[PDB]
Design a protein around this ligand. Structure first.
Ligand code: CA
Ligand code: CA
Length: 321
């Protein structure tokens, strides 16, 4: 575990650090496992109850299952829906796959066993205009998802909440220029959302009903910078937020109050390599972070990188007892 590590030193230990990105505690990720020498748009990291890693690639729709110990890579099935972008495992073991469809309106969410059986349309694709990029389950089995639509000045995107019985969809926050990453705080009273095409971080304080925003509760604690923008995110047990930066070859880390406290660089970024860092996720029961990226832009491969985060990963829904 002699991996580069993030510590609570200097301004990384302050509740409200006044600091610039160039001054952030920074480490460079170590190569962990090459998924392929061919360029694949890796995304959707998620570990099952047995600690096995699941992920996928957007353009081909391959679903991969990796053994963290042996490093064995399996490709159980392929998405029957176009451009899947995330995998969130349910408490019952099912894999929920978010997909973008035609990037205009035919996205949605389907569920299936880890072998690709029992395909279920959780959020049907053609009846609604959503193009879903990611989601996060609450402790009740309900979930919040990101509507990945629009662009900079055309905020068609937003965040919606699906009831535990999957029968209702409630808008949480709209007018977002491509909602991408999403995460719930450990107490599930704060929702973090990334807006890719406008480079903004959203922090949303929720009422006890989990759907109503507290007065003046949705704010912009951080304005990102650089092409292209923030991507997927996850938290750790200390409520820090890890945000993969798409096209920037890095991951930014924020404390529970939304202040930057860490920075993780992907090797080769300065030369234009592996800039497509899309998703961060912890190996269950540890503080070892895995980050997927790819070198499609340079005709390179698809690689998973690793570093040690500030704390152990949070026990999300798939680990509930
Ligand atoms: Ca749709
Ligand atoms: Ca994403």
């Amino acid at each position: 575990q002699d991996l580069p590590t993030l510590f609570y030193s200097g301004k990384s230990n302050s509740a409200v650090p006044i600091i610039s990105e160039s001054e952030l505690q920074t480490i460079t990720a170590e190569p962990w496992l090459e998924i392929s020498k061919k360029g694949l748009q890796l995304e959707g990291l998620n570990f099952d109850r047995q600690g096995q890693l699941f992920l996928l690639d957007v353009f081909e729709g391959n679903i991969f299952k990796i053994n963290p110990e042996t490093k064995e890579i399996k490709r159980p099935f392929v998405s029957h829906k176009a451009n899947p972008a995330a995998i969130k495992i349910h408490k019952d073991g099912r894999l929920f796959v978010c997909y973008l469809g035609d990037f205009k309106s035919t996205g949605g969410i389907f569920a299936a066993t880890e072998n690709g059986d029992n395909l279920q349309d959780i959020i049907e694709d053609l009846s609604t205009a959503y193009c879903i990029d990611d989601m996060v389950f609450d402790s009740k089995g309900g979930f919040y998802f990101t509507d990945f639509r629009g662009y900079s000045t055309n905020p068609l995107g937003g965040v919606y909440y699906v009831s535990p019985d999957f029968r209702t969809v409630t808008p949480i926050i709209q007018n977002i220029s491509v909602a991408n990453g999403i995460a719930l705080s450990t107490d599930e009273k704060v929702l973090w959302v990334t807006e890719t095409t406008a480079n903004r971080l959203h922090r949303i304080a929720l009422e006890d009903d989990g759907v109503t925003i507290q007065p003046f509760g949705a704010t912009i604690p951080y304005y990102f910078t650089g092409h292209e923008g923030p991507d997927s995110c996850c938290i750790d047990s200390d409520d820090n937020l890890y945000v993969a930066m798409y096209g920037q070859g890095r991951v930014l880390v924020f404390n529970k109050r939304g202040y930057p406290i860490g920075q993780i660089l992907i090797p080769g970024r300065d030369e234009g390599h592996m800039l497509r860092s899309t998703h961060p996720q912890f190996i269950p029961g540890t503080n070892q972070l895995i980050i997927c990226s790819n070198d499609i832009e340079m005709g390179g491969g698809s690689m998973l990188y690793t570093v040690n985060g500030f704390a152990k990963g949070h026990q999300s829904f798939q680990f509930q007892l």
